[PDB]
Design an enzyme around this catalytic site. Structure first.
Site, PDB file in Angstrom:
ATOM      1  N   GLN A  51       0.843  -1.177   0.000  1.00 39.67           N
ATOM      2  CA  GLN A  51       0.000   0.000   0.000  1.00 39.67           C
ATOM      3  C   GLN A  51       0.876   1.224   0.000  1.00 39.67           C
ATOM      4  OE1 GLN A  51      -1.792  -0.670   3.951  1.00 39.67           O
ATOM      5  NE2 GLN A  51      -0.754   1.110   4.932  1.00 39.67           N
ATOM      6  N   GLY A  52       0.238   2.370  -0.092  1.00 36.89           N
ATOM      7  CA  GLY A  52       0.968   3.649  -0.053  1.00 36.89           C
ATOM      8  C   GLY A  52       1.873   3.822  -1.276  1.00 36.89           C
TER       9      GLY A  52
ATOM     10  N   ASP B 109       6.360  -7.211   1.020  1.00 37.02           N
ATOM     11  CA  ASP B 109       5.719  -6.552   2.184  1.00 37.02           C
ATOM     12  C   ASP B 109       5.564  -7.644   3.279  1.00 37.02           C
ATOM     13  OD1 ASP B 109       3.431  -5.217   3.872  1.00 37.02           O
ATOM     14  OD2 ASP B 109       3.872  -3.677   2.338  1.00 37.02           O
TER      15      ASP B 109
ATOM     16  N   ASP C 212       9.753  -9.426   5.867  1.00 35.02           N
ATOM     17  CA  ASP C 212       9.957  -8.489   6.931  1.00 35.02           C
ATOM     18  C   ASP C 212      11.368  -7.967   6.833  1.00 35.02           C
ATOM     19  OD1 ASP C 212      10.420  -7.222   9.323  1.00 35.02           O
ATOM     20  OD2 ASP C 212       9.340  -8.650  10.549  1.00 35.02           O
TER      21      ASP C 212
ATOM     22  N   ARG D 130       8.259  15.302  14.983  1.00 32.43           N
ATOM     23  CA  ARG D 130       8.824  14.264  14.164  1.00 32.43           C
ATOM     24  C   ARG D 130      10.307  13.948  14.546  1.00 32.43           C
ATOM     25  NH1 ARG D 130       4.123  13.604  13.557  1.00 32.43           N
ATOM     26  NH2 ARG D 130       2.966  13.445  11.583  1.00 32.43           N
TER      27      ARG D 130
ATOM     28  N   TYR E 176      11.580  10.161  13.574  1.00 35.49           N
ATOM     29  CA  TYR E 176      11.384  10.109  12.184  1.00 35.49           C
ATOM     30  C   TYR E 176      12.386  10.947  11.443  1.00 35.49           C
ATOM     31  CZ  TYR E 176       8.941  10.025   7.668  1.00 35.49           C
ATOM     32  OH  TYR E 176       8.580   9.891   6.310  1.00 35.49           O
TER      33      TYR E 176
ATOM     34  N   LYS F  93      15.287   9.704   8.863  1.00 31.05           N
ATOM     35  CA  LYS F  93      15.210  10.069   7.473  1.00 31.05           C
ATOM     36  C   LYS F  93      16.446  10.860   7.048  1.00 31.05           C
ATOM     37  CE  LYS F  93      11.572   7.807   6.076  1.00 31.05           C
ATOM     38  NZ  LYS F  93      11.780   6.552   5.353  1.00 31.05           N
TER      39      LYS F  93
ATOM     40  N   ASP G  73      -0.754  11.607   0.420  1.00 28.87           N
ATOM     41  CA  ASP G  73      -2.011  11.019   0.793  1.00 28.87           C
ATOM     42  C   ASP G  73      -1.923   9.469   0.729  1.00 28.87           C
ATOM     43  OD1 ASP G  73      -4.660  10.691   1.650  1.00 28.87           O
ATOM     44  OD2 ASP G  73      -5.613  11.552  -0.087  1.00 28.87           O
TER      45      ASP G  73
HETATM   46  N1  LIG Z   1       3.208  11.698   3.763  1.00 23.56           N
HETATM   47  C1  LIG Z   1       3.675  10.437   3.548  1.00 23.56           C
HETATM   48  O1  LIG Z   1       2.806   9.327   3.563  1.00 23.56           O
HETATM   49  C2  LIG Z   1       5.152  10.179   3.374  1.00 23.56           C
HETATM   50  C3  LIG Z   1       5.999  11.285   3.227  1.00 23.56           C
HETATM   51  C4  LIG Z   1       7.368  11.141   3.137  1.00 23.56           C
HETATM   52  C5  LIG Z   1       7.932   9.872   3.164  1.00 23.56           C
HETATM   53  N2  LIG Z   1       7.114   8.759   3.334  1.00 23.56           N
HETATM   54  C6  LIG Z   1       7.775   7.469   3.372  1.00 23.56           C
HETATM   55  O2  LIG Z   1       7.313   6.665   2.318  1.00 23.56           O
HETATM   56  C7  LIG Z   1       7.484   5.307   2.763  1.00 23.56           C
HETATM   57  C8  LIG Z   1       6.174   4.558   2.616  1.00 23.56           C
HETATM   58  O3  LIG Z   1       5.139   5.164   3.432  1.00 23.56           O
HETATM   59  P1  LIG Z   1       3.638   5.224   2.879  1.00 23.56           P
HETATM   60  O4  LIG Z   1       2.930   6.130   3.888  1.00 23.56           O
HETATM   61  O5  LIG Z   1       3.579   5.392   1.426  1.00 23.56           O
HETATM   62  O6  LIG Z   1       3.051   3.714   3.190  1.00 23.56           O
HETATM   63  P2  LIG Z   1       2.212   3.219   4.511  1.00 23.56           P
HETATM   64  O7  LIG Z   1       2.953   3.685   5.741  1.00 23.56           O
HETATM   65  O8  LIG Z   1       0.748   3.474   4.363  1.00 23.56           O
HETATM   66  O9  LIG Z   1       2.519   1.627   4.250  1.00 23.56           O
HETATM   67  C9  LIG Z   1       3.586   0.970   4.895  1.00 23.56           C
HETATM   68  C10 LIG Z   1       3.755  -0.425   4.309  1.00 23.56           C
HETATM   69  O10 LIG Z   1       4.944  -0.976   4.860  1.00 23.56           O
HETATM   70  C11 LIG Z   1       4.675  -2.309   5.278  1.00 23.56           C
HETATM   71  N3  LIG Z   1       5.547  -2.698   6.396  1.00 23.56           N
HETATM   72  C12 LIG Z   1       5.483  -2.282   7.707  1.00 23.56           C
HETATM   73  N4  LIG Z   1       6.484  -2.861   8.412  1.00 23.56           N
HETATM   74  C13 LIG Z   1       7.185  -3.661   7.579  1.00 23.56           C
HETATM   75  C14 LIG Z   1       8.270  -4.510   7.776  1.00 23.56           C
HETATM   76  N5  LIG Z   1       8.902  -4.715   8.960  1.00 23.56           N
HETATM   77  N6  LIG Z   1       8.753  -5.165   6.665  1.00 23.56           N
HETATM   78  C15 LIG Z   1       8.178  -5.039   5.423  1.00 23.56           C
HETATM   79  N7  LIG Z   1       7.093  -4.202   5.219  1.00 23.56           N
HETATM   80  C16 LIG Z   1       6.593  -3.545   6.296  1.00 23.56           C
HETATM   81  C17 LIG Z   1       3.194  -2.311   5.667  1.00 23.56           C
HETATM   82  O11 LIG Z   1       2.586  -3.599   5.785  1.00 23.56           O
HETATM   83  C18 LIG Z   1       2.588  -1.377   4.622  1.00 23.56           C
HETATM   84  O12 LIG Z   1       2.127  -2.086   3.484  1.00 23.56           O
HETATM   85  C19 LIG Z   1       7.963   5.314   4.211  1.00 23.56           C
HETATM   86  O13 LIG Z   1       9.386   5.178   4.383  1.00 23.56           O
HETATM   87  C20 LIG Z   1       7.580   6.704   4.676  1.00 23.56           C
HETATM   88  O14 LIG Z   1       8.420   7.165   5.722  1.00 23.56           O
HETATM   89  C21 LIG Z   1       5.720   8.879   3.423  1.00 23.56           C
END
Ligand SMILES: NC(=O)c1ccc[n+]([C@@H]2O[C@H](COP(=O)([O-])OP(=O)(O)OC[C@H]3O[C@@H](n4cnc5c(N)ncnc54)[C@H](O)[C@@H]3O)[C@@H](O)[C@H]2O)c1
Ligand SMILES: NC(=O)c1ccc[n+]([C@@H]2O[C@H](COP(=O)([O-])OP(=O)(O)OC[C@H]3O[C@@H](n4cnc5c(N)ncnc54)[C@H](O)[C@@H]3O)[C@@H](O)[C@H]2O)c1
Ligand SMILES: NC(=O)c1ccc[n+]([C@@H]2O[C@H](COP(=O)([O-])OP(=O)(O)OC[C@H]3O[C@@H](n4cnc5c(N)ncnc54)[C@H](O)[C@@H]3O)[C@@H](O)[C@H]2O)c1
Ligand SMILES: NC(=O)c1ccc[n+]([C@@H]2O[C@H](COP(=O)([O-])OP(=O)(O)OC[C@H]3O[C@@H](n4cnc5c(N)ncnc54)[C@H](O)[C@@H]3O)[C@@H](O)[C@H]2O)c1
Lengths: 245, 244, 244, 246
Positions: free
Chosen positions: B15-16, B36, B57, B143, B146, B150, B180
């Site tokens: 997802q995401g 995932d 994992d 944050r 985080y 990062k 989003d």
């Molecule tokens: N605003 C934002 O959503 C945003 C902004 C900047 C950076 N990010 C980064 O983008 C990346 C993805 O975040 P997102 O919000 O798109 O997705 P999300 O957080 O909605 O999804 C996270 C996914 O990671 C998987 N996951 C969790 N723990 C795991 C593990 N130990 N091993 C393997 N998979 C695992 C989950 O099952 C899930 O499918 C992250 O590194 C996040 O920090 C997100």
């Protein structure tokens, strides 16, 4: 003195940059609490007016919290403790990765978390963290986990700066190039041909010398002093042109 | 397709941003191995031409090493996994700090160290890491861990890029603003007034919207493709003017 | 194509990065208006579907204003024109300083001020400016006025991005390392030993090659496209690890 | 013993604001200061301070600059302070505004450096400090188009000089403030339609709830001018009270 009235706590004070800072702070009228794990070397600084010493391992949370409960107040916290691992990502085994992450980054988290509430209750404080140009600043060879932790230091610095700016707190970090310290000499000697390792290190330095620990200290004086009250959230570079291009 | 002949492995794919990247890679002709921990969601991607899935994992070195031994070759590794803790340094307990450091940074170190040797033996490879503007790029409130992680990701990126540039390896990271995604929605819901939380996040964003995961994915396509062969060692910002 | 329906105006289009950009935009479905002072070379682009040409000296405000009045609408303005002076501050006479400031910087100010009001009236626009890593990004030897101007370009970019973000405008700049263009060849040949000059330029470049103009063009395609809508206010590096 | 003992320092725009504060700060730290400005009557006030000598100098006049340089036997530091802050977007900036700012804010530095650098090279030692701003390549700031463009240009010029002359003992850095309480800042506030309200927009930048003093900027200049900072070169040093932080 440029630091009259300041209470300053620092780590890894027994040699290198920490030692030079401790001495520089004390000469500028600060009340210095100088800490290190190396008690015999540390206690040498007790002879200097303005310096009191205490043994502290910055990886031991129990030690840190107990120390914090002993301290009435502070103006400045200078997190100096850090190890420089030699190697690429492929050269870094789990024990190298964890050892550096714990000493270089977790240490700062624990020190800030123990000491920051004192600063907040007085609506005033200043936190200086030791980073490096080998970090998010630039890419540097054979420094994988070091660069990773030292970048982490910058993130942590900007975080603290952003979170507590309205409660009178500032936070900055120092990003040196090569500094002539005992650990640097260890790293030179550790190489296969130390005569030649010394030349790779000088290659970075177009001025033909390393920085002295004293020079690093004089920047820390500036950043510790009220002169720099309007400076917060910055990685301050002191690298002799290395990151310049 | 802009990614034809490329073999791409990525994490957090269910997802995401991971999910959108998987689908965008596949549409551009890549052979995608999408991983995932969430097996049931992950396996939905199996229906898309070009995607194969594997449960992984990224905190488990043993699993990572076994996976790597299964893989004959790759071109691109995309480290996506990361968690966003809410709080200042004072809000972060040891459990919070370690959980984030392990998933967000250690993960990348273990994936890179397992897969990089493959890339070196072919004298070619491309590692893309997920960072954030909440990092060494700028200070963001609530944050702490985080941002620390990062930032670490940017250091790790530049390090890998510097060490292996002469052996045909590229390494970059991506630094979004607010995107989003389902976790973002979780973070909004988790606050005391989720109405108000949504507007604080929008205040970041002078264009009045968050980024879509698909937008982040299209940057990843550009960085994954040979179009960007001359791009290495950079944190690429995609933040809608936040860090401006 | 990735730029379908985009109207794109560009300068310095007759050779080098401008030329590669023009051809790349056209291949992706843009309606291109390619401009340059070199009329005969410029007219070669007329044979390519999607490119119309117009002679334009970007240092002449009166020409720029009259061109603008001819144009009904645009989506993208790509400011490419720039000269690379060789020398330190001490090698730069008043004539060199002023020539570079006017072509490299004043030009962008005039094109932007003439075309931006069109974009504001549509509530939509995208301005891409050609910068360099020799700029505020890093210090480079024998590039004094050049680096001064290309820094100025980043300043101007971030200014425009900040000022007009709420009116749907984005603005970014592109920061290359060494690109194999005709003017680069001219700089090489102009040295005392061109054989040896080629090697100094290469020393910059740890991958052992210069970028192609085509490669720079593909970054421009990404930045010109709606794929990158969430990207504004950034100097985008494409330097082969030079600034690393 | 002052932190600048033995240093010969030349600065521009010294009659008020940051330049004035710097002159005073350098002198109290034992520098020999040659303080210059276009405003002769105000500049001459500094002559009462030990260690400061003054000279009228318009930094847009090449001929003035070269003749001044011909008068100076040696210098350790050159501090380029002169600069005007235009209010407006790119759309508000007419040819005369663009050119005026480019010549005062940037051309000026090029000419001072080109006149004085050869002296520093001949001594194999020198230090050039340039006044920039966070409104620059550092970050985007509203209603500051030509200003930000010039102050970016300053950073480019700084790193160029630093790269070119590092092996001949020359340092070059620049200073990048946020908002500083100077007379021109007060002018810019007063010039707005509602000055009460302009003052609060400027404060909005500043999470600490204040502007910097010219003194504070000066003390950074003391550090960068001193041998304490000998290993610092090629940097834009931010002093912005957290403005660029986030
Ligand atoms: N605003 C934002 O959503 C945003 C902004 C900047 C950076 N990010 C980064 O983008 C990346 C993805 O975040 P997102 O919000 O798109 O997705 P999300 O957080 O909605 O999804 C996270 C996914 O990671 C998987 N996951 C969790 N723990 C795991 C593990 N130990 N091993 C393997 N998979 C695992 C989950 O099952 C899930 O499918 C992250 O590194 C996040 O920090 C997100
Ligand atoms: N020397 C350089 O070239 C250079 C460059 C950039 C940054 N730095 C940083 O400066 C800092 C100091 O390094 P240095 O070379 O000046 O000193 P050093 O490495 O010579 O000395 C380190 C000191 O830290 C102490 N120490 C080790 N582990 C500790 C622990 N768990 N708790 C408390 N103290 C401990 C040691 O006893 C020693 O006194 C480090 O963070 C380093 O990363 C050094
Ligand atoms: N070549 C590189 O290594 C490199 C690296 C970084 C940035 N750049 C930048 O890319 C841009 C283009 O350079 P290039 O090297 O690809 O092309 P080039 O220098 O080979 O060609 C320049 C073109 O600009 C045109 N031109 C010159 N004066 C003009 C004027 N007054 N008005 C309109 N057109 C004019 C010329 O006729 C020519 O067609 C420049 O801004 C340059 O600084 C080039
Ligand atoms: N908020 C701020 O005040 C602020 C913030 C960032 C940077 N700066 C920079 O600091 C520098 C000084 O500004 P300030 O606001 O402290 O001072 P100011 O604007 O109050 O004073 C400017 C001085 O420069 C002199 N001057 C004007 N034109 C000149 C010329 N042609 N030749 C020589 N001198 C000339 C004037 O007589 C006056 O004494 C400028 O470069 C400015 O851009 C100021």
């Amino acid at each position: 003195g440029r630091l009259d009235g300041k209470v300053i706590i620092l780590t890894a004070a027994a040699q290198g940059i920490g030692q030079a800072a401790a001495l520089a702070f004390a000469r500028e009228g600060a009340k210095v609490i100088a800490t290190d794990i190396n008690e015999s070397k540390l206690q040498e600084l007790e002879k200097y007016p303005g310096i009191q010493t205490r043994v502290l391992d910055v990886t031991k949370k129990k030690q840190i919290d107990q120390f914090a409960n002993e301290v009435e107040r502070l103006d400045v916290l200078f997190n100096v403790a850090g190890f420089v691992h030699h190697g690429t990502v492929l050269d870094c085994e789990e024990k190298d990765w964890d050892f550096s992450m714990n000493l270089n980054v977790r240490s700062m988290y624990l020190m800030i978390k123990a000491f920051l509430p004192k600063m907040l209750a007085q609506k005033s404080g200043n936190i200086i963290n030791m980073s490096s140009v080998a970090s998010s600043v630039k890419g540097v060879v054979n420094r994988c986990v070091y660069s990773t932790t030292k970048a982490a230091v910058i993130g942590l610095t900007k975080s603290v700066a952003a979170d507590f700016i309205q409660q009178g707190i500032r936070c900055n970090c120092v990003c040196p190039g090569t500094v002539d310290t005992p650990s640097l000499q260890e790293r030179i000697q550790a190489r296969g041909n130390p005569e030649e390792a010394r030349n790779d290190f000088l290659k970075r330095q177009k001025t033909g010398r390393f920085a002295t620990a004293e020079e690093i200290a004089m920047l820390c004086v500036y950043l510790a002093s009220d002169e720099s009250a309007y400076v917060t959230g910055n990685p301050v570079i002191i690298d002799g042109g290395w990151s310049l291009g």
